[PDB]
A = this chain, B = another copy of it.
Amino acid sequence: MVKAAYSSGKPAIGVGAGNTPVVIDETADIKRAVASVLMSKTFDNGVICA
């Protein structure tokens, strides 16, 4: 519906969300990264914006 709001000839701003990626390289801590991802993703079954 944000494309429906855009193509209506009126002023419109849309609050959306994109697919947010996470990059883990080789020189990072491994335990805290997995702990952080598992902590943030299960929050309210992952219906938070972005």
Chain B residues with CB below 8 A from A7, complex form: 9
Contact A9 B6 (CB under 8 A): yes
Nearest CB to that of A7 among chain B residues? B9
Q: In whole angstroms, how far apart are the Cα atoms of A38 and B18 in the complex?
A: 57
Q: In whole angstroms, how far apart are the Cα atoms of A36 and B7 in the complex?
A: 45
> A3-27: contact bitstring with B at CB < 8 Å (1 yes, 0 no)?
0001101000000000000000000
Q: In whole angstroms, how far apart are the Cα atoms of A6 and B9 in the complex?
A: 8
Q: In whole angstroms, how far apart are the Cα atoms of A7 and B6 in the complex?
A: 10
Q: In whole angstroms, how far apart are the Cα atoms of A7 and B9 in the complex?
A: 7
- Minimum distance in angstroms from A5 CB to a CB of chain B: 12
Q: In whole angstroms, how far apart are the Cα atoms of A6 and B7 in the complex?
A: 10
